[PDB]
């Protein structure tokens, strides 16, 4: 079911892990020690994945630290 | 859990389950639910008449503490489901 | 409401630990009532032995800092709370929150008495000082003295007689020590003029009150709205709801001799200005009137426009 | 007498929710036990335990969790103030909400359903022939009932307080105290929650401030909130505070309400030369937007003239008295002003900005600058302020500089008044 | 004479927040112009090395977390590179009259209680809690964490009337013991200076100043603030530290912890230590509740069965309870 | 003996250490490199900033700290690559592996309850591990 | 800049590599050198040994903390810190933290 | 449309020039070479252009750097 993580490099315990339902993949934020997330959104394919992950704002560690506080987002 | 099966509607001597055991919890939403915490980790889901008594260290009565949801109330809930994929 | 014949100050009360939440919708420097109230607690511990009467308080608010935290880039605050003892029973308890600030403020007086035939000013402002030196001014405790007792001689002046020049004089010489500070009054008449401008949809004064202190950008056929001064929403006043109760009827009162109503706050519009633009330092003081026959309690300033 | 097809038709919707679980041995007994009940007990075992709610619209839990007491839904009156504002102001839209164990809030929406576009709420109160018309059962039934159902909206039968309720001494004209219990305005605390909700986001902010993305506005008019601060209730569990929903799970924010020197500042006046050449100046962003403010009321001609009147009036006064302002910050605060270069057109600031005495002083210091009372920075301060904001000659040749002048002239002057004591 | 539904008793020896200035030993006299001790910020680039659990854990997570560095950015507080010596500086004001409730229902259950507290101060003075509270200022026990691995620690004790200084006390905290409260005479001064602070005799208003030999830009350690963790939003940041204008500081509540470490009367074991008073006497760090309710030492149950019924305890167990009083809470139901 | 005179608890130990490097006119230096994160803004920014006192370049603590406590000789997998620093799950972060694996029985966590808490003693080279462990220091238990 | 990476050729077409290398990679660095007329780098820094290192600061249980202080206290009464101090002392002795 | 450049010398490649819309005219920061604006500001008629511009605190060409620092002002 687990895929990889999205980031190679933990940003204060915090990852965005990469999930597989069937004919859909999940991200999830969460922490890396404990295993609880916050936050999650639900993706068709990993080409839709990284087709919108690579068209944010930033280089490295931005680009996820922009990618947790977007996934992650108050929903209402 | 054997408190509402001598008293299985007798809501006085769940009032008496108010009296004798420990702390409560509250469910919000189109519906309405109130959860009695009991020292043997037992979880009384109350609901107007209706009830429902858990028997925890046991994935099967979690499976029917389960059983009482709406998807509105597993749009809640989530984190107290996933709180008991422990008991082995 | 009755006009003093002295103005007493305190010259630097530097609050340690004080309460910046004061209502159930503003946030920030704390209420009038803190500072109303303290006088009458001088007046429950100094004036009835000194023969005088202490009435009104002016807030000059030097310096404020509140413990406040703003993370991962929002633009919202929050708090920054403080430990509690274990559990009854030894695990951890739950957490309540609490608003916390540094606060430094003068504080102006008004005197009634007779003191003054019986009694030098040196030592009127002088047991005054040292009676609120061990006190607790908003909910947290009152800094003693340092190195900076350098302003901490207090002044008193006879407001009625004397001529015109010593009046404007000594005021001047009173407003060269609260130089830095601003001021704080009650502005409700502008919001009674606000309905008036905004009378043509809904004349509803809460909604008025979300609609003053707020950045109003009206774009173009965009202009930010001009603020007429440094407005701000203060709490002012209770406006009981339940009927008043005999002293020995309701549970786990405070004392059982005074009697009880329920209340809730009172939301009205304040303003902070510089002490110079004060016509006289006479009309500056926080009085608090009531008329129990119904539910109607305010802090205001009459008679400053 | 449509209340029986309000009743007995509701209970059967929900018998109808009731219907996707149901086997055939259960539906033995369910048959009475939901036929039976669904006409006349499922009103008497729901009208036995109304009393496990409570519905009022200020509660006494968000002071202190532990605390149990006196809970009300009392709001009678709105006597009010001529100028001060609070929770008498709703009026309508009484978002009144439950608290209490929430396992039979059935009965409340129940209740819900006779404000659906009618007055049968003062027919739950009373009107026991409408009872006889449309429920038409017992007298003991529908009135007992009738007596059962006003007992969720009233308190529970006695007044109480508790130790963590923030009671509060009031002082009269002249005469005793009188101990005063507050709440909680949750209902006024929901509404204008509501409004800023609305406000901060949705459809029409999303579109306006979109607008500002595309530089493509229309009529509308939007505004932002500067400091809102987060009040959290609860804790970890913010479903025991009653009403919260997930919306609002502790979710309690603040509108400021900071004195204007919240942020302060370091002093730039040291003796290095950068602030020594510019100290004529002395700005701050308070002072270049009041200035600016004050520029852009150049192109404000006569047809207008309400708001030309009164604000440049004012206007001018917070920029003088922000330079007092300026001189009180660098009063009390760097007393060190000791020999450094630069000392002809920064002496006549120098006795403006008198500092303190120094300790290798002779008695030759009440004659060096003892008679100081330094007139001419009112005079630079003239030409910084002539400097700052444009005088316009259209306004010349008419008598908007004569009137201009003479608010210059009268504000300088008590200006100049008031440093007339800067030493004696 | 049932119990009063309120009580509230204000507190006394109320002291302030510590400023922290760093500077040079033998320069120790005039340290009155010591730059004080900023909090900065420095990024962490660590490994994860917690404990992992073995249900629901796949081994590419498992590995995948370990095998992969963490990025963090704390806040640090160092003393500069030509400077040995911290300074902390607080003040503390000796209030009294440690029997009078601020607010109480019942008229007879107080005027109980000022009759119990002041034939208590008949029957013995505060010399005893004065003398523990003066062993808590002579060493120590205020610098927390800094006062572990020091060469030399001196304690400057000033008593204050007018802008004046009426008289010092000099002290060396690493010679007085931690565990030991052996009597003085300089002690014995300074605590008939706090026991006729707490008796309402005069006021005291006391200035302390610390100073510790620690290494030439070595650690200091302010108090921490709290991040809430309220779910979502953990921050890039971590361990910020809690400061005043441009100076780090530490938490008015946590030296006023320091100095009512007076309990050396626990039922459990004697051969710890005294830690402070508290009622249901508790450590937060052990985890652990000295004084249970199921004994008969918890100051409620003491303080009941001596107001209401006359049933006066031992003496230690009085020390106890009027330590509790000067404590100040919120009592009754 | 004077640094194990000091772990003892026999003594107060302060030490001060100089080093000297001869690398060339002009070269250059390496202080350790801070954080910074390339987010939305305007006009760019940099993308190496380096870490600095009051106008002198200088390295972190805990880099120094790291260079200090490389002993550990001990692992399972090869001798022969060198001493690389003690941590638990004790791991390189620059090689991207993780040596002393929870699946065998060389780790911190479970010499210490094997030691602690049933009296199971490990060859004497892990107790120096251990031990060295109790002397970095960290959050151990749940 | 220049352009070192690698690349999948999935999206490399031989004229993206040439309208990559017209693109800007302009950046901005931070350096420290020595200066022109020194060759010798000077580091110093302090170093204390606290000692006690058997003591937690946080402990629940008070028997798992007593027998953990009998576990350390034996180890250190069958042998010294004298491995741990040697192999700390050569860290001390050549330069692993330049 | 357009009208003509209000400095008669380009400072950087950096000009304001001046446009007509009918019954307003709009003066407008760019480049010159290219030929894209940084910031615009519009007006109602010359006499306001003029009587604006002449009120700048400055003399020649440092006029026109305090314009061209007006009008692409930072609008937030």
Redesign the interface.
Known sequence: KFIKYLSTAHLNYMNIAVYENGSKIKARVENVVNGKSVGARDFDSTEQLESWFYGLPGSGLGRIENAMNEISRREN | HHIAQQHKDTVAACEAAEAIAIAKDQVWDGEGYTKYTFDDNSVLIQSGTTQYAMDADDADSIKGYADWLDDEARSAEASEIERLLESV | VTDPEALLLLPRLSI??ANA??S??????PSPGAFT?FV?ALQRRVGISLDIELDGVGIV?????????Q??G??????????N??N????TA????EGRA?LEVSLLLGVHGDGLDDHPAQEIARQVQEQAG?M?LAGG?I????NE?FPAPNAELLMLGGSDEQRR?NQ??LTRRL??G?A?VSR??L??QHLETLRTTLP????????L??????????QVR?K???L???P???????P??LPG????????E????????????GE?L?P??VAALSDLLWYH??E?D?????WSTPRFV | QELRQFIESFIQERLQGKLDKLQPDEDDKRQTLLATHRREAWLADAARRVGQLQLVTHTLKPIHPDARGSNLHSLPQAPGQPGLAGSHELGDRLVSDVVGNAAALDVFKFLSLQYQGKNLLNWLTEDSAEALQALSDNAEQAREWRQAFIGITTVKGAPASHSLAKQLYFPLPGSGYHLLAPLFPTSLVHHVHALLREARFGDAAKAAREARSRQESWPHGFSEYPNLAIQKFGGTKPQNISQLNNERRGENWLLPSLPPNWQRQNVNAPMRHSSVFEHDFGRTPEVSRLTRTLQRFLAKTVHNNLAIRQRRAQLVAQICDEALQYAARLRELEPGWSATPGCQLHDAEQLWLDPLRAQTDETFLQRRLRGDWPAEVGNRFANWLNRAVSSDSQILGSPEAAQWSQELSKELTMFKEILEDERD | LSTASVLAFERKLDPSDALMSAGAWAQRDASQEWPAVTVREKSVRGTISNRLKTKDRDPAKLDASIQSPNLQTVDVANLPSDADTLKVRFTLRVLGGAGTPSACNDAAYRDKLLQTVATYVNDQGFAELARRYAHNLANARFLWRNRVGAEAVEVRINHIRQGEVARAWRFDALAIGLRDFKADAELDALAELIASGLSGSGHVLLEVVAFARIGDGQEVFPSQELILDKGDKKGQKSKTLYSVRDAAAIHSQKIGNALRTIDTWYPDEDGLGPIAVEPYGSVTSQGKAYRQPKQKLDFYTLLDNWVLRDEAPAVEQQHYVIANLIRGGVFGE
């Open positions: 340690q630990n939440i004061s159930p919708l503003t946030w920030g420097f109230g009458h608010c030097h310096r404020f800092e509140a413990q406040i935290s993370p991962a929002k633009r919202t605050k929050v708090f920054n709370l403080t430990r003892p274990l009854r029973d030894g695990s739950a957490i309540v929150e540094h061990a607790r405790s800094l003693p003295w340092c007792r004089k001047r010489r130089l830095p601003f704080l409700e008449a919001l009674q509803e004064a809460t909604t008025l009150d979300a609609l202190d707020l950045c109003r950008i009206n774009f173009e056929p965009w001009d007429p001064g440094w701000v929403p203060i002012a006043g209770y406006n009981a709801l339940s008043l109760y009827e309701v549970r786990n009162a405070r004392d059982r005074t009697p009880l109503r329920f209340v809730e706050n009172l939301f009205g519009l902070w510089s110079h633009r009137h009531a129990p119904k539910g109607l309690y305010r």
